[PDB]
Amino acid sequence: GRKLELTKAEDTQLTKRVKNAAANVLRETWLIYKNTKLVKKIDHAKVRKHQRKFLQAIHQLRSVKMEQRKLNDQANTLVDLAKTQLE
Amino acid sequence: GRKLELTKAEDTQLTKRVKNAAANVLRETWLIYKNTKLVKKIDHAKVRKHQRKFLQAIHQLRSVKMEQRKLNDQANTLVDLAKTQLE
Amino acid sequence: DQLTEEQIAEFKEAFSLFDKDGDGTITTKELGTVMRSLGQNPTEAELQDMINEVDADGNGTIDFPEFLTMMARKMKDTDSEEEIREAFRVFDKDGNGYISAAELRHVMTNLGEKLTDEEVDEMIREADIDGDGQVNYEEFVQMMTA
Amino acid sequence: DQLTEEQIAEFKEAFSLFDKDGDGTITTKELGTVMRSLGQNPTEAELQDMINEVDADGNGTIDFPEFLTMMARKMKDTDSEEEIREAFRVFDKDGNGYISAAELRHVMTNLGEKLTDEEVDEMIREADIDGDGQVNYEEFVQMMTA
Ligand SMILES: NC(=O)Nc1ccccc1
Ligand SMILES: NC(=O)Nc1ccccc1
């Protein structure tokens, strides 16, 4: 039987969070790059601003990714439970 | 400056969940092993029972681990924000 | 993604673990009750996401055919040796790969659902391979998952 | 875990991002407001865990010295190249390593906070290295993180 083995691992709400956050990672990556490498004169208030927006977007995508891992393991809990009936 | 770099990664409530769930992983690992390898006559209702308890405990530890990763990234969001003032 | 006959029947039994009122349909409410009985605490949105993922026709609940179809997708399993080792590591106070027979008995008779002192006797007899009163839990877990 | 003088001063500025009422103390309520302004949604228990981790004296709030001490522990950074590449990959519809200049403009002028069509002009000028109207986003991200 299956003994100690378990299901092997690896929405619209999350999907909107991903597209907006990812677009913002692109936005702030670009604006930080521009403001640190393509200017004669670095404006640090500008860099700080886009650094804050960059970290918020990166951490938003991390949050979605973590929630998907969580959802995936919740589903796998249910599949594992169902598989006990295979014994 | 820091440009596009971010903080590098990697409770009592969680701690109790961990010790109880881990003890139960040990418990059901043992009882499944016993009932599948150290018996003359396998009792499948017994194996099914301990398989259900085993998957619940394993998935409880996964849940704690995921929450700790989440907490860690929430803290890292705050540290990242604080580091914008280094610019 | 192809299931045998015996498995289709076994999974009908499985459906009743979820369909708590037996009305032929699993709802978010029933999945909440089940998940909580398994010591998890999904949010309403997470319950809804778990129904919606396999809710083929969008009527808000999962039928047996939606449930069966889905299982076919996820039949692959993998060994749990490393996860089990990590559970033992929780009790490895000194981080040295060992848990004493005394500490193991203490854990098993006090934490979680617990074992009887007689059941612990049997566990330690198997776990303490060298008869030195110490459990190399990496080796023990390898024995049990072999 | 050792901080310079300029950094101690910069982190006093940082403390005010959190201490929203300026009363010298950061509470779970203030961390909730801040985290939500960053588009996250920590639970009450998570907010409490974040205070408690660095709450040296156990009075329930974080002071500047508790805050400063803590930062010293977490000064190490790491490059974000792969995470940034993965953000671009969200828009790689065909999974082929490319996003067209047209699709990039469409994304950047409609999703998130957005860029002006003029700002997008500048971005694409840099991104479309080969002048072929296509962005190899792995290469572009490597350029920006170099
Ligand atoms: N996503 C998912 O696996 N949902 C589920 C699993 C078992 C029963 C009912 C629903
Ligand atoms: N755990 C943690 O990092 N908490 C925190 C961070 C910044 C400000 C206030 C609290």
Ligand SMILES: [Ca+2]
């Ligand atoms: Ca029902």
Ligand SMILES: [Ca+2]
């Ligand atoms: Ca349905």
Ligand SMILES: [Ca+2]
């Ligand atoms: Ca305050």
Ligand SMILES: [Ca+2]
């Ligand atoms: Ca304190």
